[PDB]
Design an enzyme around this catalytic site. Structure first.
Site, PDB file in Angstrom:
ATOM      1  N   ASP A 130       0.832  -1.205   0.000  1.00 25.52           N
ATOM      2  CA  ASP A 130       0.000   0.000   0.000  1.00 25.52           C
ATOM      3  C   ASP A 130       0.863   1.250   0.000  1.00 25.52           C
ATOM      4  OD1 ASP A 130      -2.296   1.547  -0.131  1.00 25.52           O
ATOM      5  OD2 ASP A 130      -2.723   1.392   2.019  1.00 25.52           O
ATOM      6  N   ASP A 148       2.426   2.619   7.377  1.00 25.35           N
ATOM      7  CA  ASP A 148       1.231   1.988   6.806  1.00 25.35           C
ATOM      8  C   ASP A 148       0.085   2.196   7.785  1.00 25.35           C
ATOM      9  OD1 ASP A 148      -0.750   0.507   5.634  1.00 25.35           O
ATOM     10  OD2 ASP A 148       0.429  -1.328   5.422  1.00 25.35           O
TER      11      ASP A 148
END
Ligand SMILES: Cc1ccc(C(=O)Nc2cccc(C(F)(F)F)c2)cc1Nc1nc(-c2cnccn2)nc2c1cnn2C
Length: 268
Positions: A130, A148
């Site tokens: 991500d 994250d």
């Protein structure tokens, strides 16, 4: 992992949401500001495994460009993950609020730092999955720290979308998107295209155009991160090496890629 006693932690302000808890700014005991992610009463077994597993992986990272874990509260409820606090916040919002305020060399320096953190993660056999400017924190020295925060079609490599193949090479694709975010001061990748339109454009061979004022070498590098064939993309070691050489010979950044104008103004 370093266990912190709850009496040393003061939660002050909510700043986000966790998977089963909230995220706070607070103070840790010469007080230092911290970010605090909690796991609240009623969490499931899988949530506890994932929460302590997260603390465990974060505790083993020690890098200038990776968010630092201060410690964990596991012996008392609610459980907590406690990290350093970055006053300037997330990189995407930071750049959008500071449009045009930095030099090219400063922007490229941020990218080198992000790339160094990603090289470290990839070498440690950690696939991020991500990577995006919204997951990068900026300190008061302009140092970028990969993080994250949890949940990204327009940042994700084709093979990861198509068949769930997430590797450090799909992280390289995401890094190319992050390069574009940085050089545009946080523009939305692909503007108003829908997720399906983005995937269709990528499959048809289209790629994001050059940002304004972008060094030719930087646009060439982001384009190579977006090769359809995973094996052809640079590794993070290659990206770090190139960015470090460009910064150390900064005249290399003065040659700009041509910007395609969308609008024509004709004046005498
Ligand atoms: C509390 C906390 C727990 C975990 C993480 C986190 O980055 N975890 C994580 C997990 C897997 C892999 C990695 C990475 F590899 F490092 F990237 C990091 C970050 C934080 N710190 C945060 N700081 C901040 C923050 C920090 N400084 C200024 C403004 N916001 N925001 C956060 C979070 C978490 N969520 N949100 C919205």
């Amino acid at each position: 992992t370093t266990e912190i006693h709850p009496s040393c932690v003061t939660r002050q302000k909510v700043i986000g949401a966790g998977e089963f808890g909230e995220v706070y700014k607070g103070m840790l005991k010469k007080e230092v500001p911290v970010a605090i992610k909690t796991l609240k009463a009623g969490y499931t077994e899988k949530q506890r495994v994932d929460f302590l597993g997260e603390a465990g992986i974060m505790g083993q990272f020690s890098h200038h460009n990776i968010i630092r874990l201060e410690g964990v509260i596991s012996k008392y409820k609610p459980m907590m993950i406690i990290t350093e606090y970055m006053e300037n916040g997330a990189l995407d919002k930071f750049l959008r609020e500071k449009d045009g305020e930095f030099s090219v060399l400063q922007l490229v320096g941020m990218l080198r730092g992000i790339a160094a953190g990603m090289k470290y993660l990839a070498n440690m056999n950690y696939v991020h999955r991500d990577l995006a400017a919204r997951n990068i924190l900026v300190n008061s020295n302009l140092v970028c720290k990969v993080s994250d925060f949890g949940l990204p079609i327009r940042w994700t490599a084709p093979e990861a979308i198509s068949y769930r193949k997430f590797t450090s090479a799909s992280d390289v694709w995401s890094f190319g998107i992050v390069m574009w975010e940085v050089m545009t001061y946080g523009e939305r990748p692909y503007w108003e295209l829908s997720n399906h339109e983005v995937m269709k454009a990528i499959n048809d061979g289209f790629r994001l155009p050059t940002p304004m004022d972008c060094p030719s070498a930087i646009y060439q590098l982001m384009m190579q991160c977006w090769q359809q064939e995973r094996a052809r993309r640079p590794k993070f070691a290659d990206i770090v090496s190139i960015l470090d050489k460009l910064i150390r010979a900064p005249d290399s950044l003065k040659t700009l890629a041509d910007f395609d104008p969308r609008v024509s103004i004709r004046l005498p």
